[PDB]
UniProtKB/Swiss-Prot annotation, chain C:
Changing D83N: In NS5; has reduced or absent kinase activity. Residues 1-188 form the Protein kinase domain. The chain holds residues 404 to 610 of 648 of the full protein. The modification Phosphoserine is found at S68. The modification Symmetric dimethylarginine is found at R142. In skeletal muscle, isoform 1 is more abundant than isoform 2. This is RAF proto-oncogene serine/threonine-protein kinase.
UniProtKB/Swiss-Prot annotation, chain D:
It comes from the Eukaryota. Constitutively sumoylated by UBE2I. Disulfide bonds: none annotated. It is found in: Cytoplasm. The modification N-acetylvaline is found at V1. This is Hsp90 co-chaperone Cdc37.
From Swiss-Prot, chain E:
Monomer. Homodimer. Forms a complex with CDK6 and CDC37. Interacts with UNC45A; binding to UNC45A involves 2 UNC45A monomers per HSP90AB1 dimer. Interacts with CHORDC1. Interacts with DNAJC7. Interacts with FKBP4. May interact with NWD1. Interacts with SGTA. Interacts with HSF1 in an ATP-dependent manner. Interacts with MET; the interaction suppresses MET kinase activity. Interacts with ERBB2 in an ATP-dependent manner; the interaction suppresses ERBB2 kinase activity. Interacts with HIF1A, KEAP1 and RHOBTB2. Interacts with STUB1 and SMAD3. Interacts with XPO1 and AHSA1. Interacts with BIRC2. (Microbial infection) Protein on the cell surface interacts with N.meningitidis serogroup B adhesin A (nadA). The modification Phosphotyrosine is found at Y1, Y5. The modification Phosphoserine is found at S7. Changing Y1F: Decreases interaction with NOS3 and SRC. impairs resists LPS-induced tyrosine phosphorylation. Does not block LPS-induced pp60src phosphorylation. This is Heat shock protein HSP 90-beta. Belongs to the heat shock protein 90 family. Coiled coil: none annotated. The TPR repeat-binding motif mediates interaction with TPR repeat-containing proteins. Induction: By heat shock.
Amino acid sequence: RIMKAQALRDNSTMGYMMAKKHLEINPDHPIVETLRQKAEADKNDKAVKDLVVLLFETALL
Amino acid sequence: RIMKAQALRDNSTMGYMMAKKHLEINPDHPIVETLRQKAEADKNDKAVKDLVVLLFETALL
Amino acid sequence: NILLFMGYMTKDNLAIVTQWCEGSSLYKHLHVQETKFQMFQLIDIARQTAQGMDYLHAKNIIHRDMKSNNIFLHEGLTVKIGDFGGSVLWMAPEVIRMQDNNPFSFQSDVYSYGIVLYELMTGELPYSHINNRDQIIFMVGRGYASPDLSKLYKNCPKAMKRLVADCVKKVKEERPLFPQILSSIELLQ
Amino acid sequence: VDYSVWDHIEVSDDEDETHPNIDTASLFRWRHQARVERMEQFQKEKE
Amino acid sequence: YGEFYKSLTNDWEDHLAVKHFSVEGQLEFRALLFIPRRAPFDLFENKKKKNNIKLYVRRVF
Amino acid sequence: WCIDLEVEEKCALMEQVAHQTIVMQFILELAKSLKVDPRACFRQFFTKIKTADRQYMEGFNDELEAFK
Amino acid sequence: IYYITGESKEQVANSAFVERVRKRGFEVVYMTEPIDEYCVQQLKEFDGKSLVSVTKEGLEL
């Protein structure tokens, strides 16, 4: 956040330096429990694909 | 966003330079048309109160 | 073989090009919005602009029509003279007349300071209820008019309200008092 | 070694002589104006 | 000290704290170091560090 | 050159290959990792006291000597 | 001159303030750097034409 807000960014170098994300899931949670039961009933379900992104975005925020 | 993120600026005196938020609604768009129908039956209905915070949050974001 | 130990621990920057507050005109601050500060701050911005005018006049530098707008009020206790600024003019009658084409003498700006000091004290235009354009032009140009003391605030103590009343009396006068005005207001704080 | 030719120089747009109670950027344009008007009255005196 | 700080600094307020000391040896200096009560408006905005410690020799600046 | 006489070579001259290659190869990895020229990015960074020079240098000295 | 400022070109190009001016065939300038705020504070006009923010109240089209 702070580096992106600087006036004199030197933006190319920071565009390399920004470090990557790891997602963590709570095994006990009704959402993860449900999403797993849904994904086990059909691995290729378009509803679980649409879910995983909606869920993911919320965790960015 | 940028002034909040400065390392060495005292933002306590922002009061005279912070702007105030004016909310604008699309009169044509279905959700706002439906919201005048929802608000029509009960001006005090919490269910329409709950939208006007959720929509505000979604619009802020 | 060559792969590991990637992390490179580079330098970070703390140099800031600090934003400057767009200052309010006193019109913005007083009428056009009515933003409120305690009267000691109002006397402080009078002192601050009187120092600016004093430092200015020492260099034979004259701008005609010194006003409450061409001054800017910024973040902190911070008030500072600018040039951006029918239209709302304030004038000594010598400037109004056709008579002398360079009415350049410092006394005009001192009396125009006296007008903006009465704006600081009234928070509303001088002559705001009294006149339309014909009367406010003619009677002032003829030397035959004064703005009312009714709008001048009684939360001011005797020291500064009397000094401001002398800033009305200076219309009758030729005195370039600025360093001594500055002394007077400073000491009366 | 006389340097008296250099004694007095006028510079508008000088940051070393800005008064703290005046908008600095206003003072430069305003100090430049005085220089040019002084020169034009002296050119008129030559006419 | 309290009225000396106001004289040196043009402040209204009394000093927050003082150090006063003398260094012996070949370098014989004496120094006052005052902390202001409230940080000056332009503490970081200035082009260069604005005159905070003044150096004297035999009481001439 | 550290490959040239691996069967027989004397420790000092190969320990100087360790030094040259670790410093230059780190730079070349940064030059792939950034836009920079290896003359423009520069050995001002070699002042650093950090454990990443000391521990990792000897770890790779052993790896690169032993394998060939 | 119509302009908008924000965190990237595509985030600005998709932003909800921009649809009417696109539909009406106007040209929007994209200002995607933190330093743009500080020059736009001072560049109030160009060639006698004022600069108007697409993200402020009272926007006239």
